Design a protein around this ligand. Structure first.
Ligand code: CDL
Ligand code: PC1
Ligand code: PC1
Ligand code: PTY
Ligand code: HEM
Ligand code: HEM
Ligand code: XP4
Ligand code: LMT
Ligand code: LMT
Lengths: 124, 54, 438, 383, 75, 61
């Protein structure tokens, strides 16, 4: 699935009052049980990157964001191999779990999908 | 020649279909031809030639 | 809606053709001739180009210096070019300097001295031109392309001619060439911009009335070329950019497939990494090439002559390890003109061409060049309404049928210059002219 | 330049076993690949040695196996090693495949090694099935008969194909001699495909338990994973020792110590344990052709995991619902195994059908739904 | 005066659209024939192929109706 | 010897009718015949060879 898809569906849910009332609390619990914050990751660090679109989005990260992501990946890898969890400031707090990558990938995919559409235009 | 090229040769799908169909024909006709020729050069020698006595 | 092209004749058979534009203040008048290098044989090859030099070297009245001064005093300039099938001599001036310019052109064409002293002087100038074209890579590639595609035929010869001929061209053979070829029934006097047609016809009656007519007047743009699939490799490892042309035999000016070949050419189109918009072009080949950095540029062409043409592409690339991919993807895009094109590509290319054929004519020199080219190749100026109708008549079936008989599984002429180690041998290139999956 | 890099032959070995850059955080489930290589080496060494003493003719086959047990020096060990390592091979391959499914090893960019892996698994099944026939005991013969008769379901030509496979009108000497020749060959084909899936993997490298790139933090294969592999090699050899020396027949069927008799039918004809889940799936469909298709589809459906997993994240480490679903899928696969060897009786007939539906609905319904919903929960939950 | 270019997006999937695929439909046809002829040719020797398919073809079909004389057949 | 625009002599090899459909069709007839005999030879080879796996004469007896 494309990030575009995921974001659009999420926005449909967040619009509907009923839907958001039942989905938002579930989603927050899911994230708590997922436990990626206990390895000091932000959610976007987990997105599959071995794709042309994602490699292009990662190249467009500002250098600071890019250097910080590299450190979180190395740090999480060291927790993984040691079978330890983050403690203290290494744990990602909910307020730090920012969608730093989502805007870049949405722009990459926007162009990719427009190109697909326009490759199939029919002069009327 | 243009017609023949355009129908049987231009598209590789058609070329391969023509080659395979020809191979099928060749195989059946060559079999029959060799069988007859073999029977003529070895006439009176084969079981089929003496079978009538028995 | 552009003003109507007026056309008149003289008694000798000289055509006068004009298109006025009351919004400009300059005018381009000149003489388009249906004659060029292709009219030479092997012995006098180079003559037409030699004459072009001598035309500006002095006449029976004005000397070389007087000629220079006369043009300087007019205010505008004179220009000339000789091609394989066409020669042009024109003068861009101010509105009211048109009678001067017609008079100077008439003089240099009819009454040129061709003095042995001047022949001998230019004989060195032209000899130096042989060693300096070497730098204009596009021209080197296209001249080798003609030489090989039309091997040992008149269209295959260069315009400059061999070194041997340059040393042996006499004033006699120069005079003979221009007497046989520069005849009134082969010539068109063209005016574009701030010109009055009736004024131009009067000037033609004054200056070009004593032009010889040919014995057997054929119509303008009257011509047998036997294309050779072949290759020239000019490998030069020290050059950073590879230049490659690939062509098949194309269409003449008066072919029934002339517009179909232009539409097919527009489906592949052009590309240049230096232009900002080129990464966003709709052409499939454009997308492949830009995404993979295969080339600095490519330019599709469909060159026409009276009785043949060349249709193909010219590529330039610094990516010397992926020349194979570049050639592979280009020829697989040509395959798709036979196997896959539909109304989607055809209607898009038609849209782009309907404008393109009009956009090209954006100044008086371009207009004059268009009137002159069309009059000397077709015998008439084709109105934009007729052109719009011929383009509209091109269907996807026409493009597919044309590509299947012109491109699909056909021989190519191929020229490579520069670091072309990665360009495979002829067979592997020519094998991409068809698709085994189809 | 070091010789191991400069020489092209040495450099190939170097690239796979020494300088190969690995993630620094592979867990012990990344050790099954080297265990499978070990099983393959043991099966080649024991199998070639058994071939030096075994006779493929139906009149002598069963007795040649008894001669191996009784007269050949260490023949009992070579025979038991070969028979038990066939079971260990399947334990390791199910573990390796389970690792791959849990950690998303089938996702881009590793679709090619996974797809070749599915063919490896099919070749292992064929190899093991033919090897089991070679004993020519009762289970050998009757297993060959019933499994080869599944081919009769192929429409129009099915019966003809069966007679062609058998080389006669029933399982007999021609079938045994051809199964010997093919059983000897198939492990070499299997080794080539194992090599192919590793060369395909080498373009992306190993995945890792977190599912993220390891391009940020690589370790050489040697010495780190060489020495970590030795631990599981010695653990495997301990398990091997307990079966081969102390309980050599625990994983087998006693009926295979009775010589093949085409007249007497054994009480229950079952495949070896590692084929049992596929046999339960076949029983679930009442139609003969239906059942064969379902059974083949149960393996080929692994090829669609790259498509039906719609997750934006690789692997299950951080996906609580996917982990629950995976747990149910694995336990269902074990229950199918158990149902493969029960009698065709109530209430196991219906249970086998429900488990079969669950097996397929994992791929077709549940994994696509769950992976879609988890995408939304990760996005909304972290806003 | 024209305010906007006139176009639609045709439905597409995996980079295929109906105009393009429709051009290749006949090619799939011929490849299908090629594969059919080839397959049938490969199993021409199988007795069932002869019995059920080849011997039923009009005129030509007698090529595949061949009986061994009972005197020449050990089986 | 010096000019690269003067193509070397290929007249000993050039066919006059090189652009015709007849000319191409002949070469594809040779390629096609070759492909045809290779197909018939492969079919014969495979059929005779694989028949070793069908019941042998002693089994049929
Ligand atoms: C057969 C041939 C013999 C060779 C043996 C090879 C097997 C080795 C292997 O792959 O598993 C060892 C493996 C230890 O491997 P590890 O690399 O330390 O951690 C791997 C897990 O991803 C790390 O998992 P974790 O850190 O979340 O720890 C979980 C684990 C605790 O694992 C510990 O070792 C602690 O405990 C359980 O899951 C038990 C479930 C509770 C039942 C009550 O044991 C497991 O964790 C098995 C859990 C499977 C359920
Ligand atoms: C029986 C059911 C097994 C369910 C496993 C659920 C996850 C779990 O707790 O496992 C521990 C561990 C959990 O490891 P993990 O990598 O998810 O988490 C490590 C710890 N954190 C999250 C903090 C980083 O899972 C494994 O190691 C799973 C490997 C699966 C192998 C299954 C073999 C079955 C063969 C049948 C093939 C068809
Ligand atoms: C051993 C078995 C050989 C099978 C060959 C059977 C027919 C295929 C054949 O002749 O190939 C011709 C074809 C075509 O040869 P070609 O590649 O020279 O023809 C292409 C140009 N057109 C389509 C215009 C004729 O080759 C293939 O398709 C490759 C398959 C050969 C194996
Ligand atoms: C019985 C079979 C196992 C016994 C062999 C192990 C080696 C015995 C001791 C020798 C040793 O430890 O020295 C190292 C040799 O190990 C090595 O060079 C090999 C390291 C581990 C041995 C085998 C690797 C297994 C990995 C994959 C398993 C494959 C199973 C498939 C068949 C070199 O020590 P150093 O090289 O670290 O440097 C240190 C500086 N010289
Ligand atoms: C992947 C590799 C292999 C697997 C999974 C495998 C599996 C098996 C199995 C299940 C049996 C039946 C064992 C029994 O119960 O007695 C067997 C028998 C046999 N295998 Fe293999 N085998 C493999 C490789 C080989 C190889 C390479 C040879 C080389 C010839 C071979 C030769 C034999 C022989 C001769 C027998 C019959 C004797 C016997 O039963 O022990 N095997 N194999
Ligand atoms: C003879 C059987 C096999 C052998 C010897 C073998 C060996 C290996 C080895 C050594 C690796 C790299 C180390 C590791 O991750 O464990 C590996 C990776 C892999 N194998 Fe296999 N394998 C075999 C069968 C299979 C099968 C049946 C599948 C799939 C159905 C498979 C799919 C893969 C995949 C996807 C990986 C990459 C996993 C990753 O690192 O993320 N293999 N295999
Ligand atoms: C016997 C041997 C069989 C060889 C069969 C080859 C069949 C290949 C057909 C094929 O490539 O179709 C391409 C066509 C889409 O066209 P395009 O998008 O590649 O231009 O694709 C679709 O239309 C779908
Ligand atoms: C695991 C069994 C052990 C035997 C190894 C398997 C034998 C067959 C492997 C050869 C197949 C070719 O495998 C290919 O080799 C080259 C060099 O060897 C590797 O190349 C890699 O290493 C070399 C240096 O070590 C670098 O130049 C290169 O940039 C890098 O990609 C490829 O990543 C690998 O895919
Ligand atoms: C993917 C490939 C498709 C499957 C391949 C098919 C495998 C087996 C098919 C037929 C094999 C036997 O098919 C049979 O073959 C032999 C030749 O081999 C033929 O036999 C014919 O020639 C042989 C010698 O060449 C003579 O002994 C015989 O008297 C004559 O009839 C039979 O006419 C045919 O019925």
């Amino acid at each position: 699935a494309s990030i575009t898809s995921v974001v659009k569906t999420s926005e449909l849910i967040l619009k509907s009052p009923l839907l958001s009332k039942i989905v938002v609390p579930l989603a927050k619990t899911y994230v708590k049980f997922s436990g990626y914050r206990q390895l000091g990751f932000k959610m976007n660090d987990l997105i599959i990157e071995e794709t042309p679109n994602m490699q292009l989005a990662l190249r467009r990260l500002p250098p600071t964001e890019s250097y910080d992501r590299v450190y979180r990946l190395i740090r999480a890898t060291q927790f993984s191999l040691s079978h330890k969890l983050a403690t203290g400031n290494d744990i990602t707090k909910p307020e730090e779990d920012d969608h730093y990558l989502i805007p870049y990938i949405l722009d990459v995919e926007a162009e990719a999908f427009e190109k697909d559409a326009l490759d199939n235009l029919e002069v009327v | 020649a243009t017609t023949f090229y355009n129908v049987f040769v231009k598209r590789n799908s058609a070329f391969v279909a023509t080659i395979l169909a020809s191979a099928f024909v060749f195989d059946m006709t060559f079999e029959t031809a060799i069988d007859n020729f073999w029977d003529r050069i070895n006439a009176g020698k084969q079981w089929k030639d003496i079978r009538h006595k028995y | 809606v552009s003003p109507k092209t007026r056309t008149s004749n003289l008694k000798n058979g000289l055509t006068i053709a004009s298109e006025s534009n009351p919004l400009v203040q300059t005018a381009t008048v000149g003489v388009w001739i249906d004659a060029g290098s292709r009219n030479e044989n092997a012995y006098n090859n180079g003559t037409a180009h030699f004459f072009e030099h001598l035309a500006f070297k002095g006449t029976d009245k004005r000397s070389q210096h007087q000629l220079e001064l006369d043009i300087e005093n007019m205010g505008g300039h004179l220009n000339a070019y000789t091609s394989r099938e066409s020669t042009v001599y024109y003068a861009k001036s101010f509105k009211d300097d048109v009678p001067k310019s017609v008079e100077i052109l008439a003089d240099i064409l009819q009454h040129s001295k061709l003095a042995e002293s001047a022949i001998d002087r230019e004989r060195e100038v032209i000899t130096r031109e042989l060693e300096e074209v070497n730098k204009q890579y596009e021209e080197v590639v296209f001249d080798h392309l003609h030489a090989t595609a039309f091997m040992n035929q008149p269209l295959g010869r260069t315009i400059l001619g061999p070194r041997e001929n340059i040393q042996t061209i006499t004033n006699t053979e120069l005079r003979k060439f221009i007497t046989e070829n520069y005849t009134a029934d082969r010539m068109v006097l063209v005016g574009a911009g701030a010109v009055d047609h009736d004024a131009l016809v009067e000037l033609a009656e004054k200056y070009f009335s004593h032009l010889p007519s040919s014995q057997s007047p054929v119509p303008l743009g009257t011509p047998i070329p036997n294309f050779v699939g072949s290759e020239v490799r000019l490998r030069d490892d020290t050059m950073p950019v590879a230049h490659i042309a690939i062509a098949v035999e194309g269409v003449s000016w008066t072919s029934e497939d002339y517009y179909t070949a232009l539409v097919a050419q527009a489906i592949i189109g052009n590309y240049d990494r230096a232009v900002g918009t080129s990464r966003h072009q709709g052409s499939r080949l454009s997308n492949i090439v830009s995404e993979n950095n295969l080339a600095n540029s490519f330019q599709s062409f469909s060159t026409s002559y009276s009785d043949t043409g060349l249709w193909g592409i010219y590529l330039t690339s610094e990516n010397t390890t992926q020349i194979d991919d570049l050639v592979h993807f280009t020829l697989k895009e040509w395959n798709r003109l036979s196997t896959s094109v539909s109304n989607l590509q055809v209607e898009r290319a038609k849209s782009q061409l309907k404008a393109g054929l009009l956009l090209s004519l954006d100044g008086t020199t371009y207009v004059a060049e268009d009137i002159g080219r069309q009059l000397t190749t077709l015998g008439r100026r084709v109105t934009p309404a007729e052109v719009e109708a011929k383009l509209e008549a091109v269907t996807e079936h026409d493009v597919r049928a044309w590509a299947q008989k012109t491109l699909y599984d056909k021989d190519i002429a191929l020229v490579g210059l520069g670091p072309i180690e990665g360009l495979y041998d002829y067979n592997r290139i020519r094998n991409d002219m068809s698709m085994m999956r189809w | 330049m070091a010789l191991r890099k400069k020489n092209s032959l040495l450099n190939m070995a170097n690239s796979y076993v020494l300088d190969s850059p690995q993630p620094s955080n592979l867990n012990y489930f990344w050790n099954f690949g080297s265990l499978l290589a070990l099983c393959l080496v043991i099966q080649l060494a024991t199998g070639i040695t058994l071939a030096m003493h075994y006779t493929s003719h139906a009149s002598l086959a069963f007795d040649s196996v008894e001669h191996i047990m009784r007269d050949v020096n260490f023949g009992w060990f070579i025979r038991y090693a070969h028979a038990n390592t066939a079971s260990f091979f399947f334990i390791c391959i199910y573990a390796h495949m389970g690792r791959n499914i849990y950690y998303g090893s089938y996702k881009t960019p590793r679709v090619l090694p996974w797809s070749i892996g599915v063919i490896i698994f099919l070749l292992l099944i064929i190899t093991a099935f033919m090897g089991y026939v070679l004993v020519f005991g009762q289970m050998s013969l009757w297993g060959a008969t019933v499994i080869c008769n599944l081919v009769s379901a192929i429409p129009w030509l099915g019966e003809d194909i069966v007679h062609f496979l058998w080389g006669g009108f029933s399982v007999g000497n021609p079938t045994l001699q051809r199964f010997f020749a093919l059983h000897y060959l198939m492990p070499f084909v299997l080794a080539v495909f194992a090599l192919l899936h590793l060369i395909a993997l080498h373009t992306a490298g190993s995945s890792n338990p977190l599912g993220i790139t390891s391009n940020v933090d690589k370790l050489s294969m040697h010495p780190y994973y060489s020495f970590k592999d030795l631990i599981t090699v010695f653990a495997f050899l301990l398990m091997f020792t307990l079966f081969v020396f102390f309980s050599p027949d625990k994983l087998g069927h006693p009926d295979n110590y009775i010589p093949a008799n085409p007249m007497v039918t054994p009480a229950s004809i079952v495949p070896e344990w590692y084929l049992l889940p596929f046999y339960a799936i076949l029983r679930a469909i009442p139609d003969k052709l239906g059942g064969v298709i379902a059974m083949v589809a149960a393996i080929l459906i692994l090829l669609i995991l790259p498509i039906v997993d719609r997750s934006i994240i690789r692997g299950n480490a951080f996906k609580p619902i996917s982990k629950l679903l995976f747990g149910f899928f694995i336990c269902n696969f074990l229950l199918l195994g158990v149902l493969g060897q029960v009698h065709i009786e109530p209430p196991f007939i219906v249970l086998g059908q429900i488990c079969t539906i669950f097996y397929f609905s994992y791929f077709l319904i549940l994994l696509p739904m769950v992976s879609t919903i988890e995408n939304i929960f990760f996005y909304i939950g972290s806003l | 005066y024209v305010k906007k270019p006139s176009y639609k997006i045709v439905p597409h999937f995996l980079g295929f659209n109906i105009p393009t695929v429709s051009k290749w439909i006949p090619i799939f046809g011929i490849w299908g024939a090629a594969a059919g002829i080839g397959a049938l040719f490969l199993i021409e020797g199988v007795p069932r192929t002869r019995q059920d398919i080849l011997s039923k073809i009009p005129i030509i079909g007698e090529h595949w109706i061949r009986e061994i004389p009972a005197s020449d057949n050990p089986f | 010897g010096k000019s690269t625009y003067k193509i070397p002599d290929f007249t000993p090899y050039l066919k006059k009718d090189r652009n015709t459909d007849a000319n191409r069709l002949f070469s594809y007839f040779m390629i096609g015949s070759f492909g045809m005999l290779s197909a018939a030879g492969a079919k014969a080879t495979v059929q005779d060879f694989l028949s070793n796996m069908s019941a042998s004469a002693d089994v049929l007896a």
